[PDB]
Design a protein around this ligand. Structure first.
Ligand SMILES: [Ca+2]
Ligand SMILES: [Ca+2]
Ligand SMILES: [Ca+2]
Ligand SMILES: [Ca+2]
Ligand SMILES: [Cl-]
Lengths: 22, 90, 93
């Protein structure tokens, strides 16, 4: 049980070019 | 042919939608929803949350627009924090 | 619950895909522009447009790189994943 105490332009470009479906 | 990375991303959306949708604002996580997510879905990585003070601290950290709740963008920051912390202990 | 959750297995898949690409060349704990490109073109082929121009990978790495070493460590990669996931969500409203 290795747990912590819970206190711890180009992307629009490559998301815009996601064009498909004629 | 969707990839492991992409499936992983979609599951993040799905787990957010599941918990945000229970109570109140169906698109945001309130404290109680956030706490259940951590106790039900992150139990092998995070220590159980039992105290309200802790829920409070976590939400305050995550909440960047000051509405007391956690939207998806704020949740993704949470997943990055946590995932990064685990990567460091593996 | 006691089983690894869908969430926990997603996180694990993120760690694995990173080390899967970061381990190829040079530093095994970082993605050079070379390695980042391959990751994007093969694993985000439904979310991001394929990269084939050098000008592009230059710009992507510049934005991801906050410590200024010209490479992407895990923390920086998680930021990238956060950014992309947020976008797909945004395209589901
Ligand atoms: Ca809610
Ligand atoms: Ca908020
Ligand atoms: Ca490398
Ligand atoms: Ca770096
Ligand atoms: Cl949503």
């Amino acid at each position: 049980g290795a747990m912590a105490a819970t206190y711890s332009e180009s992307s629009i470009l490559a998301q815009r070019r996601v064009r498909k479906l004629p | 042919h969707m990839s492991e990375l992409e499936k992983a991303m979609v599951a993040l959306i799905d787990v957010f939608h599941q918990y945000s949708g229970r109570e109140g604002d169906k698109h945001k996580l309130k404290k109680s929803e956030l706490k259940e997510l951590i106790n039900n879905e992150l139990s092998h990585f995070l220590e159980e949350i039992k105290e309200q003070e802790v829920v409070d601290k976590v939400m305050e950290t995550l909440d960047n627009d000051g509405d007391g709740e956690c939207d998806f963008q704020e949740f993704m920051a949470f997943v990055a924090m946590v995932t990064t912390a685990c990567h460091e202990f593996f």
